[PDB]
Write a protein that binds this ligand. Structure first.
Ligand code: 5S4
Length: 759
């Protein structure tokens, strides 16, 4: 006999429990609603049995039914009180079980009536576990109910401790419902927040460098052509320049612009800016003065380090310090007093952001120190090593080249433009000088694999999708990834096999990588999503662009971690390696350069003849993209003019390699234009001229190219020039990079045989 109120919100009314209870001639009132004290279905009730009831009973009821309200909670009850107990048992790797217990004032803290341990298998899904747990607790209830109703079971207190979860705690994990135990813990291990006690970065870059100098002062720090500087020599010179900089009022977090070509003076001035206390802003002297003015405007830089050669390219915009004027260097050669702390800026580099002119990416000392401190032991760089300073001065590839190796006591070899494009000669230099390790952009690196090289032990590549891995050296090859906003690379991969999609590898020190969906929730391993970065790699954000910083540098709503929303799509592979999958937004990597097409379209448009422009990135069927500038106009505009037009405001790498005239743009009914629709794509007298035409035909993917056509106007870019040079070397005679631009048609090139007939 006796009446039982069965409370549930998730279990059905045909539960094994309910059917069993009335089988024993209890009338079981089933209730799936919220109840209060005065409620009409509470007067003649003897037992309350709650199973997965989604509300808390007001204490008046639990007090009126002391000892007669039992709850079924599928958890080893000290552990995983509250919601989603089985899920949390797995994730938090707690003991597993089910508990029948008495209800109290608080959430599941009442004394245990019956409890029993249960086990999950690695291959059970989260839903499987949930069911197995329910099945277990229902049968436990059925076996022991007779004992409970007769009150012959001694209740015992739960052991102190345990965990508790509310409904929302599982939001972040909402996409994991169908995952298995193995996959879920694997996912956990990959994204598990490190345990407290992880060591923070306690020093700034220039601080660690000074240490490196103290230990190996007479080792060669940097080499340019025949000239070189030791660590002691380099440290002292930078110090002298640094004192002057601080004397002119440079303070921590101050921007100091540097406008120089690759040289010893460049390394000296960079180090001087750090040691002085501020952060350096690299300004390519071959940039349009307008562009140079802008970088100087956006940056608050009151001081500019430059040579007499490039001085007015700043157009009096800023106070100038000549790196070749002896007045610029102080007598003092001792290391400056430290005034910078690790979260201070170390440098500011401009990259193409999503909208407007350009963004100044702020990178901090601890960021840079983290990357170097990872780099040295990872690649086992010793003072015995020698590294090439290849990448341009305004991109973090140079930061990779310069900083990581100086802290290892290795020697930097400045690559002058003399060999920069001629990789055959660069290779010879390497074999001659014994260049053991360096970073080459994907475009250069893929071409450098062709060189007969015995010099290298390790080469690192990144910044564009790596396609080729066949190489003629015995050195190891590495592919890394990382946006400029997160301090050079956050992820590294050792290329061991060929791949259709070469992974970008695993995260570096003090960094975690999260693949999240649009709701910012975890994606299962193997499942694509947006790539999020967490840790020491994150910069301060965009200079004077706080709104944009807020968008890309988010505080995660469920986790509260500062995270960088890359805009990159990616996935975890089973081996833990990350695989890059492109981007939804129209932002592209052109020859390793970050490029927003919408940054170029407006400069194209203010041309007095065109009225509408869109520029797109297209593939070479080699897996990477080139820029095409689409413009509407009365008549075709000569490629040369457009190039110079844009060239007055934009850096050369931003200038498209193809321009397409259209009389009209195709339009979708909804929107302005449908991008998808835009179309895609004189014999020589002597035979020597002919034998130049076909190498040219190959390099530009052109059949039977006419001699009188301009190299640039036929899709020529720097890498296409490089390939042409080596193709002219392997089966022909030698040509320089700069010579090719002065003589861009084959006709002028044919004239080059005057140079060797003169010899
Ligand atoms: P032309 O393109 O003008 O000749 C230049 C080129 C491609 C031959 C090569 O020298 C070059 O300068 N390539 C791009 C240089 C660069 O630094 N791109 C940014 C690097 N991208 C990244 O993702 C890096 N930040 C990480 C470290 C891989």
């Amino acid at each position: 006999m006796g009446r039982i109120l069965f409370l549930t919100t998730f279990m059905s009314k045909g539960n094994k429990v309910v059917r069993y209870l009335e089988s024993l001639h209890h009338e079981v009132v089933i209730c799936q609603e919220k109840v209060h004290a005065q409620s009409a279905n509470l007067q003649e009730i003897d037992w309350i049995v709650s199973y997965a009831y989604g509300y808390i009973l007001d204490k008046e009821i639990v007090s009126r039914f002391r000892g007669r309200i039992i709850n079924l909670h599928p958890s080893l009850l000290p552990w995983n009180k509250g919601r989603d107990p089985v899920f949390w048992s797995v994730w938090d790797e707690t003991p597993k079980g089910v508990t029948i217990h008495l209800i109290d004032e608080h959430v599941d803290t009442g004394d245990i009536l019956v409890q029993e341990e249960i086990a999950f298998a690695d291959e059970d899904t989260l839903l499987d576990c949930y069911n197995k747990a329910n099945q277990a607790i229902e049968e436990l209830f059925i076996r022991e109910w007779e004992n409970i109703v007769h009150g012959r079971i001694a209740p015992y207190r739960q052991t102190a401790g345990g965990t508790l979860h509310f409904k929302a705690d599982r939001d972040f994990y909402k996409n994991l419902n169908m995952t298995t135990v193995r996959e879920l813990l694997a996912l956990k291990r990959l994204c598990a927040e490190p345990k407290r006690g992880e060591k923070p970065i306690d020093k700034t870059f220039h601080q660690l460098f000074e240490q490196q100098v103290e230990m190996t002062p007479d080792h060669v720090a940097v080499v340019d052509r025949g000239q070189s500087l030791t660590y002691k020599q380099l440290n002292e010179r930078a110090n002298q320049l640094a004192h002057h900089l601080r004397g002119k009022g440079v303070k921590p977090d101050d921007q100091v612009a540097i406008m120089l070509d690759k040289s010893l003076d460049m390394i000296v001035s960079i180090l001087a800016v750090m040691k002085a206390g501020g952060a350096y802003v690299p300004i390519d002297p071959d940039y349009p003065g307008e562009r140079i003015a802008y970088m100087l405007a956006d940056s608050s830089a009151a001081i500019l380090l430059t040579n007499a050669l490039h001085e007015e390219k700043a157009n009096g915009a800023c106070d100038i310090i000549d790196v070749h004027d002896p007045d610029s260097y102080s007598e003092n050669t001792n290391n400056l007093p430290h005034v910078n702390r690790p979260d201070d800026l170390v440098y500011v580099m401009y990259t193409s952001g999503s909208t407007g002119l350009a963004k100044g990416v702020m990178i901090e000392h601890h960021n840079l120190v983290n990357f170097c401190e990872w780099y040295r032991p990872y690649f086992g760089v010793t003072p015995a090593d020698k590294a090439l300073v290849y990448s341009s001065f305004s991109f973090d590839g140079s930061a990779l080249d310069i900083f990581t190796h100086l802290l290892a006591g290795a020697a930097l070899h400045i690559v002058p433009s003399e060999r920069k494009y001629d990789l055959d000669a660069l290779n010879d230099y390497c074999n001659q000088e014994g260049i053991t390790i360096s970073y080459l952009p994907t475009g250069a690196a893929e071409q450098f694999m062709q060189m007969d090289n015995q010099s290298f032990r390790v080469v690192i590549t990144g910044g564009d999708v790596l396609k080729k891995i066949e190489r003629n050296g015995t050195y190891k090859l590495y592919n890394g990834y990382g946006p400029t906003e997160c301090t050079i690379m956050v992820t590294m991969f050792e290329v061991d096999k060929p791949y259709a999609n070469i992974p970008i590898g695993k995260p570096i020190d003090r960094t975690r990588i999260l693949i999240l969906d649009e709701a910012l929730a975890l994606q299962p391993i193997g499942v694509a999503g947006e790539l999020f970065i967490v840790g020491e790699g994150l910069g301060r954000g965009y200079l004077n662009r706080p709104e944009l910083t807020a968008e890309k540098f988010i505080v995660h709503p469920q986790t509260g971690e500062r995270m960088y929303r890359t805009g990159d799509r990616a996935r975890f592979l089973p081996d833990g390696n990350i695989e890059f999958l492109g981007r939804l937004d129209n932002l592209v990597k052109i020859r390793g350069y970050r490029i927003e097409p919408g940054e170029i379209e407006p400069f194209l448009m203010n041309h007095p003849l065109i009225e509408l422009t869109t520029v797109l990135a297209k593939e070479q069927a080699d897996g990477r993209k080139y820029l095409v500038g689409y413009y509407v106009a009365p008549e075709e505009i000569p490629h040369g003019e457009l190039r110079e037009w844009l060239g007055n405001d934009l850096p050369d790498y931003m200038i498209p390699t193809y321009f397409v005239h259209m009389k009209a743009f195709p339009l979708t009914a909804n929107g302005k234009v449908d991008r998808r629709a835009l179309p895609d794509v004189v014999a020589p007298t002597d035979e020597l001229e002919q034998q130049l035409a076909q190498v040219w035909s190959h390099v530009l993917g052109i059949p039977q190219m006419g001699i009188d056509d301009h190299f640039l106007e036929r899709g020529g870019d720097s890498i296409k020039v490089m390939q042409l040079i080596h193709q002219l070397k392997n089966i022909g005679l030698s040509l320089r990079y700069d010579q090719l631009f002065t003589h861009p048609t084959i006709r002028q090139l044919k004239r080059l045989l005057t140079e060797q007939a003169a010899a």
